[PDB]
Design a protein around this ligand. Structure first.
Ligand SMILES: [Ca+2]
Ligand SMILES: [Ca+2]
Ligand SMILES: [Ca+2]
Ligand SMILES: [Ca+2]
Lengths: 137, 17
């Protein structure tokens, strides 16, 4: 575990911790899951927090986030792939990638989107398959 | 489950900067 990795996870933790108070509530986990096209129930959101929770106090703080991010898998990558692959055809098109990305809080122009695809696209078909997705994650 | 969101977000941060 390197100072550089610790730093990245910290910057990652921030994006979940909206109010910047230093805790992830189910309220903020719910904001994240929803902009990823999911609709978890308040008890599903509570189940996900117990997965990280060490105290039993209902919130994730940074040391608990780090424990988890560090402890860690094929199941979770496929699960992430599915968030992007909305029509379930096994390829992430530029429309689908743009769609997910704006929901998270960007507006990319078509050239920004195509740049990102070009970066991921090994076989040059202009869409991201699963092999290529592991590579970018 | 929760880790998938974690890596989508890591990718997302990695992409904003
Ligand atoms: Ca918070
Ligand atoms: Ca806690
Ligand atoms: Ca697709
Ligand atoms: Ca491709």
């Amino acid at each position: 575990l390197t100072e550089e990795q610790i730093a990245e996870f910290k910057e990652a933790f921030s994006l979940f911790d909206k109010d910047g108070d230093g805790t992830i509530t189910t309220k903020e986990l719910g904001t994240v899951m929803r902009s990823l096209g999911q609709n978890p129930t308040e008890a599903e959101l509570q189940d996900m927090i117990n997965e990280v929770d060490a105290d039993g106090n209902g919130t994730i703080d940074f040391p608990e986030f780090l424990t988890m991010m560090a402890r860690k898998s094929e199941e979770e990558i496929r699960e992430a792939f599915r968030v992007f692959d909305k029509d379930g055809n096994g390829y992430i098109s530029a429309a689908e990638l743009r769609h997910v990305m704006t929901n998270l809080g960007e507006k990319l122009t078509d050239e920004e989107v195509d740049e990102m695809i070009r970066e991921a696209d090994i076989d040059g078909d202009g869409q991201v398959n699963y092999e290529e997705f592991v590579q970018m994650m | 489950k929760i880790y998938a969101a974690m890596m989508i977000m890591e990718y997302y941060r990695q992409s904003k900067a």
